[model samples]
Target: KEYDIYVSYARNAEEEEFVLLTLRGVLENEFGYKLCIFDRDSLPGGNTVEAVFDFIQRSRRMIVVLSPDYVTEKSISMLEFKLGVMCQNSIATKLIVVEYRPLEHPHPGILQLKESVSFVSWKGEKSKHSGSKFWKALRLALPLRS
Candidate 1:
């Protein structure tokens, strides 16, 4: 499938239902987008080294889910984010960052990706702050739906 968004997150996401599953549910079920996740979409016996480049090439945009779990870890773990940064320069893939929780004041991981890259901060539990405005800002980057 020609994916519209490639969900990039760290391993801690697999421990919880936070970033990946929530977005996967909403983006696929509610929003109806063709999504590609590294774990689910990619094959088990497949060569993920090659899959990374292939996935980036196939996807239109990289929807990077930024959280406390994201990087500042071992070598293999860092590879995923490394590609996202590389994509900014090498490929046409646009990046949209979503803050799951409160990060540091300045240069908090994904915050330091680029000076001009816009991000969506989803800190609210209620719909008022997150729902209406979140989708609006997201639509500027992606054609998000209900």
Candidate 2:
């Protein structure tokens, strides 16, 4: 089955429990959207390259957890970076970026990515705002719920 969202994140995004968990919880649990999350659901012996791109193609939109931790890794981010650049000209926007948290000094390239497009910077989008602007923006970004 095709997924509603494809999640690309680094290890720390999960380890920190500050961003990834809440995002997955809200989108998958609270909203009940189908998400393809790697760390949480990897095929035992699947081909890594094919798997990454497969999820990207199958899902309607991609939600990337952007943070200092997210930028540090090249694993999945590399694919995101490439496909993101490729999708720029497509009529359908295939990416949804979320600034998982602040980064004092983001890796130069990472800082430039996905900012050109509309992204949910929860730091600014929400605060004294649990039902944050980020939440509202994120929901709006997704495919309509049934």
lDDT agreement with native, every candidate? 0.65, 0.66
Candidate topping lDDT = 2
The per-residue C-alpha lDDT of model 2 at residue 69 equals 64
Colliding residue pairs in candidate 2: none
Q: Pick the candidate with the highest TM-score.
A: 1
Query: Ten-residue segment with the worst summed lDDT in candidate 1?
Result: 122-131
Q: Report the Cα RMSD per candidate.
A: 3.4, 3.6
Candidate 2 residues 1-146, lDDT tens each? 38888777656535336445567678877678988776666686778777776667777777776776666646566566556545444534467777766766845655444544558776643442447777888888888882
- TM-score for candidate 2, please give it: 0.74
Residue 39 in model 1: lDDT: 75
- Candidate 1 global TM-score: 0.77
Pairs in steric clash, model 1? 30-146
